[PDB]
Design a protein around this ligand. Structure first.
Ligand code: CO
Ligand code: CO
Ligand code: CO
Lengths: 275, 275
């Protein structure tokens, strides 16, 4: 019988306009409306499953921040990540007696800086990613980009570590990984290719791991509120409505990528698990 | 030998984040980055062509602003329009001794509040609009929305006044209206359905009227910088690159929807015309 762990991998801050587009627009009375710098959790999910350990997302690389960090200067100042050492993925896994080598499957929701940071560690896993997301990230790597949400140094390491990739084709959906574990293909929206996960736990029932397909309850609505910069705005909305439909049809809880208040109510890996 | 006039129809102000998404994002050094209320012009173009007069866009309705205005309260405070009576479209057309009934074709780039405000004056003209733009605005009407970029009161009057609509089908493109005058179908992007115009003038050469498909030189780039909220982001980028391609292949100049510095340099209808 599977156990599912929520691992706390620190906090990030950014302009709220990135999370909720035009959340507070200028008006005649407030022509110089100040934005704000919200904080939100970064997290990862481990499913300790009889058929093999599954990891959903991988958080940020420990070498992300600082003068010698992988993230570019402007990226560090716009999306600072604060994490104590216990928050690093390898530490969180170690405290559960789980070594990187023990992971059979890693689902990369997408290849942004806060979800793909530690892919390089899982050299024995099959790494599951959307084919267009994989293609889009590799192109940014070939153009040698120092700034942005795709980290050159992270991608460099994935290639050097020769990860065993399995790309999800753009017309593939509902891919059964193990009993009660199903990959959901949301396609393009927030990024080129978003994957989610549906988990059926014997006791707790259905869970949908949405990652950045839905940032928060405010994004989810109604009304649906899209992020400030969006790759495929139509796809984004269509993906949110697909999540809602699946949630309703399967009586599933939806776990957002970065909701401070939802995350607060999760039992974390320091305290236990869901079964 | 056709003449082309540029009619100044006033100025509008709004949060710059509407024009250029995430122009000045929050940082650690500046967590409450203030936005800015920017000013830009609203304008329309009349082509005096021997085969018939042609109007491109129609600015805002004189009854838009104020306590009794058609624009919702929030809309007025986020997108205030300023204009003296001489800026009104019926007054610009009068100063040129052209009567609304003379106009053979009115091109509605799209049906937003600052481009479709005076469609109701043109009861004899053929009103050309993208079929999905028409559908979309009509839905907002049926839903009685009092706020937003589609104006319930304006749509009301279009229906009351029984306009002669010609919808451009979503697969139609390069529709010849008269010698040297061609409708360009950009499709979804900024709105559900964008139309531009290509104008071949004997002396001045090629002119592309982009309207809201490209706000300004900063939007055009490169790099292309999208608006802050955007209906169809992929569509938006596709249309800009189509505008670039056509401008290159025809050696045409691109007239943006709302570029202050470009507009400053145009020859207004008070001073003369292009030929
Ligand atoms: Co992301
Ligand atoms: Co994220
Ligand atoms: Co406009």
């Amino acid at each position: 019988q599977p156990k599912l762990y929520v691992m706390d991998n620190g906090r990030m801050r950014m302009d709220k306009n990135w999370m909720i587009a035009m959340h507070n627009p200028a008006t005649i009375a407030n022509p110089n409306a100040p934005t704000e710098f919200i904080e939100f959790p970064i997290y990862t999910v481990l499913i300790d499953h009889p058929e093999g350990k599954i990891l959903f997302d991988t958080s940020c690389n420990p070498d992300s921040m600082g003068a010698q960090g992988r993230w570019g200067e402007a990226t560090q100042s716009m999306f600072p990540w604060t994490a104590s050492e216990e928050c690093y993925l390898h530490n969180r896994l170690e405290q559960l007696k789980v070594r990187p080598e023990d992971i059979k499957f890693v689902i990369a929701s997408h290849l942004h800086l806060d979800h793909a940071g530690c892919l390089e560690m899982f050299t024995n896993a099959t790494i599951i990613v959307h084919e267009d997301e994989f293609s889009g990230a590799l192109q940014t790597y070939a153009r040698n980009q120092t700034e942005g949400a795709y980290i050159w140094g992270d991608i460099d390491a994935w290639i050097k570590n020769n990860l065993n990739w399995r790309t999800i084709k753009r017309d593939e959906d509902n891919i059964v990984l193990a009993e009660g574990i199903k990959i959901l293909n949301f396609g393009s929206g927030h990024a080129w290719g978003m994957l989610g996960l549906h988990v059926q736990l014997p006791e707790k029932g259905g869970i949908i791991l949405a990652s950045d397909a839905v940032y928060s309850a405010e994004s989810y609505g109604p009304p649906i509120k899209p992020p400030g910069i969006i790759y495929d705005s139509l796809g984004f909305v269509r993906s949110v409505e697909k999540i809602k439909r699946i949630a309703k049809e399967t009586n599933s809880e939806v776990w957002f990528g970065h909701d401070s208040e939802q995350f607060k109510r999760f039992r974390k890996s320091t305290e236990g698990y869901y079964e």
